[PDB]
Structure formats: C-alpha cells, structure tokens
Amino acid sequence: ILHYEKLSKIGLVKGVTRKYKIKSNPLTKDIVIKMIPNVSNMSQCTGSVMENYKTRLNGILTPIKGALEIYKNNTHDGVIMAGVAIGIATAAQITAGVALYEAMKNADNINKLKSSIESTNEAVVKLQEKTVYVLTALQDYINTNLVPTIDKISCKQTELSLDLALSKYLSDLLFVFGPNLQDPVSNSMTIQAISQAFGGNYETLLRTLGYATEDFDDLLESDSITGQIIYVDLSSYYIIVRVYFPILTEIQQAYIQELLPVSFNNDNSEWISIVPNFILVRNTLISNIEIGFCLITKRSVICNQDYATPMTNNMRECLTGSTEKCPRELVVSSHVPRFALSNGVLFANCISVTCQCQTTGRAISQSGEQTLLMIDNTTCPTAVLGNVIISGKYLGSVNYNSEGIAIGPPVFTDKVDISSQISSMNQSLQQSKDYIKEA
C-alpha cells in the first residue's frame, strides 16, 4: 500500500522485506561467580595483597547488598510487597523485586553449600546439590602461569605480578560493577556485561549453563539474553546470578520494508529525499521503528522490545503515493549513491554517471525533465555503468520513463541549522502578525 512505483521516481527504490521478531518466555538458570581466587598452593608469597584486595572488593560489593536488602526486607509471603517501606519505585523495579524474592528459594539452596563453594581451586567446577556450576576469576591464570614458575622466580616478583593481576581485574570490573550500577534490582542487564566478573568470556558461561537452540547467536547478539543478581555474600565474596534464556516469537501480519535511497536530478542539482529507510507495516498501519537498538539479519529483524514510534501524518500521506509532501535535501558531496538495482531493473540518475548500453553500442541519455531513468530489457539488455557491466524486466507500468511527477520542497538536516531555521521562521511569523495587526 506504499505505491513503490511512485516512490521510485524520487530515489526510494524498494529493497528487502523482512519479518519482525521479539523475545518472550524466558527460562531461568542459576550460577555462582566466585570473585576471589584460591592461592593455597602459593600462600608463602601472598604478603598483604589479599587483605587490600578483600577490602576493596568489600567496598565495591556492599552497596549492591544494601540495595538488594531494601526489596528483600519488605516482601512477605502470592507475594505481597509493602509499598510504604519502598517509598518510590517504578513498575519495572517492582517486577524485578518480585522475581528476586521468588528466586530466594534457589538462593538459599545454593547458599547451603557455602563451605564447599569457598574451597574450590579451578576455573570451572561442578558442585552437586540439580547441579550448580561455580566459576572463579583469575583462578586459571594463577594455576597455569604463577604456580608452575613458583621455584624459577623470586617470591617478591610473584607477589608483584599477583598484585598487578588483581588490580587489572578490579579495573576491568569497576566499569560495570562500580558506582555506575545503581539499580541491581532489574532484569535488563545483558550477560555480556555480567561476564566481566568472570573475565569477559561469556562463551564459557553460556556453554557451562547449556544453551539448546539453533538461533542462539541471534538471541545473544541482540542483547536479548540478560541476567540478574539474586544474592551477594560479603563473607565468601561470591554472587549468585540468574540467567534468562528467551525464545524469539515472530509477530504476525507485521513486516519491515527497506527503501534504498538514490540521488535524483532536478533544476540542475542533485537532491536526496529525506524519508525513513525502515518502515514497520504492522496490521496495515504504517509507523516508524528505531533501528539503532534492533539487530538486522538478512531475513528478519530482531529486537528485545517493541520500538514502534508514531510517524507524522505527512509522512504516512506521502508514503501512500503523494510525493508533494516528501521533502528533499541538496547534495554537495561527491560520494552519494547514484544508481540502484532492484528486481533486475536498474534505477539510475543517468546524467551524473556515464550510463551507456552495450549491445547496440549507443549511449543512454536523459533529458532535464526526468528525475530518474529506469533501464530494463525493453531499453536494452546489458548496461555498462562506469567500470561495471551488468545484465531483467519491469513488472510495473510499461511507460515508466515518460511519466513525470511533482516534487516537494527542500529542507536542511544539519543539527545547527535547525535552530536558525526556527528563529528565522518565527521572525517571519512575527512580522506578518504585526502587519496584520496594523491593518
């Protein structure tokens, strides 16, 4: 219902149509992340690094515990939350707190193994309880780089290297678990960020937990797999995190259409239409979509939320075959698409690029009246555009070239120029208002 043929005359050539997907129905998996390595094999060399590291780690961790206790103290046995005590909170925070309280059963079950959790010296261990996987930070580095050379190097270099490693790990961790994270009660934190505790390789975490699907990569890349912190221990220095595995559910009667832009010629100038590239047609209701937060694959578009945004009535009126309402922007740069191929036909502003056929050896020319030139079998089979030769047919109107259409007014999309345009516009409006008042 977009009248693609009329849009193609102003450089908006129909592109690839994709389906729309959104996450739903997560599955929960608990995992412990021990934040302090075990150095029982090389304790002769620790010195005072461990004390300072523990002090700094406790300083980092305590605010998280203080924030979580706010929602753990009040919630009582469904589940009733005392609104008075909480005071101020949004809906997402309330839902996250409800989930956190619901997770307390598994949190206690995991905590029952506190003695065994603290006494693990390995990168990844499996403790039977259902089984729970205990990870460790820097325990692989200590095991395979420092312990082997305990006898080759002095106990002053080992201590210094361990201190440097701990400091670097803390520096990396502070970016995520520092003062920036002030909303622990929320399930919108991606596993990629949460993996900074273990060292930055979320692949090991996901493989250990166990992912069962073929589209796992698409879920992972679009920030659709998130985790939550359900318990923090200030004594053994470990946090239990719950990972959510959702499933993509394609939405029905909804698809995203992409429009490839092209620069057309008018009044001896190259212009580009200013129209959104991605259009979300859902239930025959056109609207915009925020693509910055949405992953784009070859056959579909995946988002973790519904990003549809209202679109101004003028845009919807224009996309439905009314080119008078679509603005244009002048082109001064020399690097802008000048031709585009769709469905086998070639739409190309044929004045700027030396477009010239091959079979008959003549040249393809366009008069100043035309905006874009369409080339297909009828004109001639093979087209020699610049330095590339190319070889279909057009299923639309037969007399596409000699039609002509009205075009809209120009605009400027520079960030600074918006303010100047608004100010001058107002200046003009005020003058007209004063003139009307005078007479």
Partner: antibody, heavy 117, light 104 residues
C-alpha cells in the same frame, strides 16, 4: 609436635649415612621440610628443602652429594662420600606455612651430631 | 644472595642494634633468628617486620631492600645469644648470615 630425629654415629669417610626425622603430632604433607646444618662453633648452613611432592631443591655449594627423600610420615637426608668437612650438628626444621616465604624455619628439631673420623 | 652482619655489640641494660645488608635486593623478605648455645634456633622475625607469635612486644626490627636492622628495645639477661638474619626470598637457594654475639 616435636620433630624428633634419629642421629648418626661417626663413620669413616667413603661410606653412606642416613638420617631421619620422626615427625609426630602433625601432618607431614602440609608443610615443607627444610634441612639445615651447623658446623661446631660456626654459623648455620642451608643444605636443601623438599616440596610437598617429590621435588627437593639443593644448595649451590653441594654437588649432589646429598639425597633428600620423603616417607609416609618421615623425611630422610642420606649422605654420600662423607669427608671431614661434613662434621656438624644437622637440624630438622619445617617451614612456616605462609606469610614468611620459603624456608622460614617455624619449628626446629633437637639436632644430631654427625661427626666424621 | 650474600649476608654481612657486623655489629657484635656488648651493651648491657640498653637498646642494642644489629644490622645486615644483602649483596643484592631481597625485597621485604628476611628473617631474624635467635640461637642460645645448646639449643636450636627459634624464629623471632619473618618478613623483617612481623613478629612470630610468642615473642615479647620487643624485638622490633625493620628495613628495606638489602638493608635490615633489628633493635632490642628492652634488654635483660634472658636475651643474650647468637643472632642470624637469613634471606628467605628464593626457593631455589636460601642462605644464612654470619653469627653475632650480644655477650650481655
């Protein structure tokens, strides 16, 4: 708790000799077992250490004339090609478990005088 | 790697200082012992600042790279015997130092 060690009678040069530490009251695999020597009226001298496993490191000044071994609940320092220089009161000590470095000598044995003819 | 304690102080009723310096840097790792005649040495200080449990509040020594010194604040008859300062940095080779005589 006391690292009682068997002594060694005077032996003619050129014959092997063996000493042992009859450790009791504690686990012998938890800590290193360093060996020290003191010639009469002279300063202490280091003659090697043994890891928890079977890996013993020796002093530079000894050309592999000693042998450090570990038994289930005892350690042994066998000597080869003894000479007049070997006479001393050998001591058996256990390194401090942590916080001091290698060969901290937290606890020491009574010592035994291995004289040489 | 090499030690050279030379104080041989013979003061009675007052503070006595013993000093030893390693040939090369040894970091903060060095232990001070005590050996009365006819008895095995007993650890007094390890890491050059820490006191082994049991020793009195005195026997406070300190220092830095290849320079260490132990000071016996409150001296009495019971504290008179040989003193040693062992380097305990390398696992491969740790060596003692020359004996010292307080001879109170």
């Amino acid at each position: 708790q006391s690292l009682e060690e068997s002594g060694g009678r005077l032996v003619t040069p050129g014959t092997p000799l063996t000493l042992t530490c009859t450790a009791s009251g504690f686990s012998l695999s938890s800590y290193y077992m360093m060996w020290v020597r003191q010639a009469p009226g002279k300063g202490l001298e280091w003659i090697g250490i043994i890891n928890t496993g079977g890996n013993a490191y020796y002093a530079s000044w000894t050309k592999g004339r000693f042998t450090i071994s570990k038994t289930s609940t005892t350690v042994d320092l066998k000597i080869t090609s003894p000479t007049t220089e070997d006479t001393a009161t050998y001591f058996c000590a256990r390194a401090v478990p942590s916080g001091a470095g290698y060969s901290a000598g937290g606890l020491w044995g009574p010592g035994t005088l291995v004289t040489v003819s | 790697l090499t030690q050279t304690p030379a104080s041989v102080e013979a003061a009675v009723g007052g503070t006595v200082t013993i000093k030893c310096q390693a040939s090369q840097s040894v970091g903060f790792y060095l232990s001070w012992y005590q050996q009365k005649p006819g008895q095995p040495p007993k650890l007094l200080i390890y890491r050059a600042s820490t006191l082994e449990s049991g020793v009195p509040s005195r026997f406070k020594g300190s220092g830095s790279g290849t320079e260490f010194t132990l000071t016996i604040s409150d001296l009495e008859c019971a504290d008179a015997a040989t003193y040693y300062c062992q380097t305990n940095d390398y696992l491969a080779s740790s060596a003692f130092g020359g004996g010292t005589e307080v001879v109170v």
